[PDB]
Design a protein around this ligand. Structure first.
Ligand code: RZN
Ligand code: YB
Ligand code: YB
Ligand code: ZN
Length: 607
């Protein structure tokens, strides 16, 4: 039972394949076309089925060349409207049929962002991108919008000729549109079965550069060179990930660097990972996001969560694999540094929601909860903390990686629950079940707050961050003279970020301390998005009026939610910037990503 979907469940019928034929209309901000679903009945005498939709216009439904009866139910808030289709002939178990639905999206589709030329790097062409995770595929096309159903797809997309279309699939050629010479048709094939949240589309003035044997980086012309350099470790990461998870089955591993309003750090769209341009630090320092997206090719894309309640399975295992990739590239001390940083992020999330909040539970109950509202670091970090604890309890990384590879092999091409994972963990570790029975399963999986046990972490790389943060916190006015640019000489960008993270946990600091920090460290000159974000949060919470225009600029010039949401909230919580934060949101709302616009509105209590 998937409480987020209104469609017929996997026990009734299963979509086996999607053949999508569509045209992108920038003037109307609509995607129009036909979604032909190959549906397999899982029941005897199947006469009707239900599909998920959200703000879709249905023109007709065709089965066996004839139009059939359908009905759109009343809208159920964020879930959309159910679409019941009357089948012309009763289906027996395992019988397949093709249902072709003629549809049109709404300009307000929660899955899409339509950008004007002014909102792009080039300023001459418009741009479109999708973001289906968790339940936005229903806002693009009628489907069984649940990760419990996996399907292959083929697609032909008609776009203005001067533009390029890309999808979460293998490129299968381009031709002039035979129905319109002002347009091109781009063809795509996804031969590996995927849950529909992994369906993705981008249309814009895109250019590409090869950066590895199976990797192209894609972006507007202005970002190509910087992107090629920033993501040059991609191939070495794919090789490490293949060694940890088994064969890479997707063919290509391309990267697309989206415009700044992209709401997430990355999206593991198969064959084409989507990334935020906020990763473009110039020194490859934010490459762990690539390692994370690469890891999803095994944990999430091959082994998938059956429902959104089990999202931690996707995230926890991915962060675990991501930290191993970074550990192989940079050393075990670095994997422990990243792991310890993750615990810090988990403390922050638990503190933000409250220790008894249901969204701090590992396995969540999303009945009547919009998944976008529940989204946080909890499934990533609590999920990671559990696996890291288990690794330590079971004999170390080598032993635990053996389980991870067996888990990926066991559940490849399947959709699983926490119980399925737990059953396999007990099966694999049958000779260590006594150790496994010491785990407080009920607390780890179903209780809110911080985990019952904190793993053991090497402190080697964290010590200097803690030591510097503590000097600043315990400093009195007469100790401020002792700080100098030399304090940072031996700190990496990651350590500088951790120093800021540690200090932010104790924010506010006295205004005089923050002014001294700028005077000696010149944190205002740092363009690294993670460091700049933490520094500006530190300034705003410490009530520095000079930081107000810098924080407003960062909150609006980019739209990665990790940054935009807390910056708007910090600005709204500071009396001096409250009105500006609200008015800036109101002015930008219409041109923001629809999900980001909704969430910032809720955060700022602006309806
Ligand atoms: O485990 C908490 C939780 C959080 C979010 C969630 O759904 C998502 C997933 C990705 C993107 C947006 C929403 C499902 C579960
Ligand atoms: Yb081909
Ligand atoms: Yb003193
Ligand atoms: Zn992820």
């Amino acid at each position: 039972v998937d409480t987020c979907s209104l469609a017929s469940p996997a026990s009734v019928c299963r979509t086996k394949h999607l053949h999508l034929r569509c045209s992108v209309d920038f003037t109307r901000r609509t995607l129009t076309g036909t979604a032909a679903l190959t549906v397999q009945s899982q029941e005897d005498n199947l006469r009707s089925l239900v599909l998920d939709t959200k703000d879709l216009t249905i023109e007709k439904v065709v089965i066996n060349g004839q139009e059939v009866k359908y009905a759109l139910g009343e809208r159920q808030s964020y879930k959309g409207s159910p679409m019941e289709i009357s089948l012309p002939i009763a289906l027996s178990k395992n019988q397949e049929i093709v249902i072709e639905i003629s549809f049109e999206t709404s300009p307000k589709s929660s899955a899409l962002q339509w950008l004007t030329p002014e909102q792009t790097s080039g300023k001459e062409h418009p741009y479109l991108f999708s973001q289906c995770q968790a339940i936005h595929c229903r806002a693009i096309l009628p489907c069984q919008d649940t990760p419990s159903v996996k399907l292959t797809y083929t697609a032909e997309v008609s776009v203005p000729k001067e533009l390029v279309a890309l999808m979460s699939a293998i490129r299968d050629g381009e031709t002039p549109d035979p129905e319109d010479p002002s347009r091109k048709i781009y063809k795509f094939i996804q031969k590996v079965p995927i849950p529909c949240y992994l369906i993705a589309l981008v249309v814009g003035a895109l250019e590409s550069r090869q950066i590895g044997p199976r990797t192209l980086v894609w972006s507007e012309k202005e970002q190509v060179e910087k992107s090629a350099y920033e993501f040059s470790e991609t191939e070495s990461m794919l090789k490490i990930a293949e060694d940890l998870g088994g064969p890479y089955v997707w063919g290509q591993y391309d990267l697309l660097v989206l415009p700044p309003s992209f709401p997430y750090g990355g999206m593991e769209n198969p064959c084409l990972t989507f990334v935020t341009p906020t990763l473009l630090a110039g020194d490859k320092s934010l490459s762990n996001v690539i390692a994370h997206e690469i890891s999803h090719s095994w944990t999430g894309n091959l082994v998938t969560n059956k429902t959104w309640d089990h999202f931690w399975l996707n995230e926890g295992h991915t962060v675990y694999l991501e930290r191993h990739i970074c550990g192989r590239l940079f050393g075990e001390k670095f994997r422990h540094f990243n792991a310890l940083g993750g615990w810090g992020e988990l403390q922050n999330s638990v503190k933000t929601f409250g220790e008894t909040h249901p969204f701090t539970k590992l396995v969540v109950d999303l009945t009547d909860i919009d998944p976008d509202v529940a989204y946080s670091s909890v499934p990533y970090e609590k999920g990671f903390a559990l696996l890291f604890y288990l690794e330590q309890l079971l004999g170390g990384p080598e032993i635990f990686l053996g389980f991870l590879k067996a888990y990926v092999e066991k559940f490849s091409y399947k959709s699983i629950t926490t119980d399925d994972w737990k059953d396999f963990l007990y099966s694999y570790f049958k000779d260590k079940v006594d150790v496994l029975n010491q785990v407080d399963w009920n607390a780890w999986l179903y209780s809110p707050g911080l985990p019952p046990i904190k793993p053991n972490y090497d402190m080697t790389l964290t010590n200097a961050c803690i030591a510097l943060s503590q000097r600043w916190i315990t400093a009195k006015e007469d100790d401020l003279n002792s700080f100098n640019a030399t304090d940072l000489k031996d700190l990496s960008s990651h350590q500088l970020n951790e120093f800021l993270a540690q200090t932010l946990q104790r924010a506010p600091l006295p205004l005089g301390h923050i002014k001294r920090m700028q005077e000696v460290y010149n944190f205002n000159a740092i363009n690294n998005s993670e460091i700049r974000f933490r520094w500006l949060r530190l300034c705003i919470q410490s009530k520095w009026e000079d930081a107000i225009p810098l924080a407003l600029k960062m909150a609006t010039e980019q739209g990665r939610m990790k940054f935009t949401r807390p910056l708007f909230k910090d600005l709204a919580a500071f009396d001096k910037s409250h009105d500006q934060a609200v008015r800036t949101y109101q002015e930008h709302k219409a041109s923001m990503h629809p999900v980001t616009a909704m969430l910032v509105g809720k955060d700022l209590k602006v309806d």
